[PDB]
Write a protein that binds this ligand. Structure first.
Ligand SMILES: Nc1ccn([C@H]2C[C@H](O)[C@@H](COP(=O)(O)OP(=O)(O)OP(=O)(O)O)O2)c(=O)n1
Ligand SMILES: [Mn+2]
Ligand SMILES: [Mn+2]
Ligand SMILES: [Mn+2]
Ligand SMILES: [Mn+2]
Length: 438
DNA sequence: GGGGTGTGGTAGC
DNA sequence: ATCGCTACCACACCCC
């Protein structure tokens, strides 16, 4: 057990945090793409007609943790038992749950205690531990398989369990559903073999947005090919508004208020005007949703196809620790800030950059919120405060950065005992060139 | 037009 | 117990 004022806290927390693992795995994949392709020109041009294959593991953590489960879980059955991956037993996040669990209404991100309430009597939840190294190894097999197939011009990492793979069609070749179906089945079988039993589903389309919707329709353990010329009422009727890219809870709430509570993308499609859409959720989001409902990508989304190196290039660097923050005095806060800056500068030096602007964000307990929230060591109900500072010269100097980070904390005026979370950020990154005579 | 700030939402999730 | 991370875009509103 490692408390936040222990030097080992950052290491222990990140070792246990599945969300830290997801973010670090994604950042590593982005860096590997940029280094694999230092010379290879990977971009899609306007001359290219392309097909998108959006490929994603089915309940990734749950599948892998089950396949690699310890002897205590030998009799566990993946197709018959509701299985979750989590740390705890009560207010612990379900990182992933299998499709049996989902048939009862359980979802990723729910708390274990919330999920147990949805099971009828006689049905018990099986909770498996995290297997972080195996998650990474199966993802390696996944990405290696996608390359070995030699069928994609461009393989874009989306996450540990997910990639956008692009196939350019020569104007002389006649693409067919049958050819796409066989590619989907090849990919699914080769990854199933290469991962020793994990399944992926595949959305296949001529837009990024349709491939994402096709993928959702394909799941679990299937594929779906839906081109813009294949669009239909049956297709749109199969999705909730939440399924549209760019629509999270806050946008969903606004769309439900503005358009008489639609219950499918087919509902929304028939009720919306572009202008009321923009008014409800915002101008750029409203235009994105408008295009998405026609099967079409927006300018912002297409950038990853036409300039992936620029898109996947890292422009900021940060850490966020909003769990286990319980400090008694400012000396201990300041030491934690120093440890966080040391960790971030180690990353900054690994990528051979300097930073010219930094940000500190904190979570502060709301005045009438309990000192100890429902979730053990949780941040609880808070408000956020951030403040940033431009540095004189771009720097990688600990003394400058840590001093300014501690000044930003001082500026924000949060009593140490009220602190519930900290984020430390390097906002603008500058390359270190061969010439440093200044 | 150009620049900036802190806040908020969502993509990974 | 329990491990609620990270990057980027968009916005409202300020400067000149
Ligand atoms: N709230 C969440 C959502 C996802 N994940 C982790 C666990 C997932 O297994 C993994 C991949 O995320 P996905 O969105 O791809 O979800 P799954 O792979 O679990 O299920 P599926 O994609 O079949 O819906 O990311 C998490 O930790 N917390
Ligand atoms: Mn998945
Ligand atoms: Mn995924
Ligand atoms: Mn959504
Ligand atoms: Mn997902």
């Amino acid at each position: 057990i490692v408390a936040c004022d222990d030097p080992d806290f950052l290491t222990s927390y990140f070792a246990h945090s599945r969300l830290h693992h997801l973010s670090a795995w994604k950042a590593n994949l982005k860096d590997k793409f940029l280094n694999e392709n230092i010379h290879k020109y990977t971009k899609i041009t306007d001359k290219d007609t392309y097909i998108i294959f959006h490929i994603d593991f089915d309940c990734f953590f749950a599948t892998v943790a089950y396949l690699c489960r310890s002897s205590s879980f030998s009799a566990c059955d993946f197709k018959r038992d509701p299985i979750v991956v989590c740390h705890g037993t009560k207010n612990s996040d379900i990182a992933s749950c299998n499709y049996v669990a989902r048939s009862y209404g359980i979802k990723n991100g729910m708390w274990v205690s919330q999920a147990e309430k949805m099971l009828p009597n006689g049905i018990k939840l099986i909770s498996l531990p995290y297997t972080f190294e195996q998650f990474q190894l199966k993802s390696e097999a996944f990405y290696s398989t996608l390359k070995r197939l030699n069928i994609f011009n461009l393989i874009l990492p989306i996450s540990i369990d997910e990639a956008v793979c692009v196939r350019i069609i020569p104007d002389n070749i006649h693409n067919t559903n049958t050819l796409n179906a066989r590619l989907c089945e090849e990919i699914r079988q080769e990854i199933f073999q290469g991962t020793n039993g994990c399944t992926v589903s595949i959305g296949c389309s001529d837009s990024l947005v349709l491939a994402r919707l096709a993928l959702k329709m394909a799941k679990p353990n299937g594929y779906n090919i839906t081109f813009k010329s294949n669009l239909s009422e049956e297709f749109w009727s199969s999705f909730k508004l939440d399924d549209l890219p760019g629509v999270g809870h806050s946008t969903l709430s606004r769309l439900e208020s503005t358009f008489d509570s639609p219950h499918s993308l087919n509902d929304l499609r028939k009720r919306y005007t572009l202008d009321a859409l923009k008014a409800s959720v915002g101008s750029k989001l409203g235009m994105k949703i408008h295009l998405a409902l026609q099967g079409q990508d927006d300018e912002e989304s297409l950038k990853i196809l036409y300039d992936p190196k620029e898109v996947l290039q890292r422009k900021s660097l940060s850490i966020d620790i909003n769990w286990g923050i319980r400090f008694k005095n400012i000396t201990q806060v300041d030491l934690f800030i120093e440890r966080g800056c040391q960790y971030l500068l180690e990353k900054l030096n690994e990528i051979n950059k300097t930073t010219s602007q930094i940000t500190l964000k904190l979570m502060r307990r709301c005045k009438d919120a309990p000192i100890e929230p429902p979730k053990y060591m949780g941040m609880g109900r808070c408000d956020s405060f951030s403040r940033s500072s431009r540095l004189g010269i771009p720097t990688n100097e600990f003394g400058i950065i840590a001093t300014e980070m501690k000044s930003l904390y001082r500026t924000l005026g949060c009593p140490p005992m009220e602190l519930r979370g900290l984020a430390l950020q390097f906002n603008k990154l500058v390359d270190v060139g061969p010439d440093n005579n200044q």
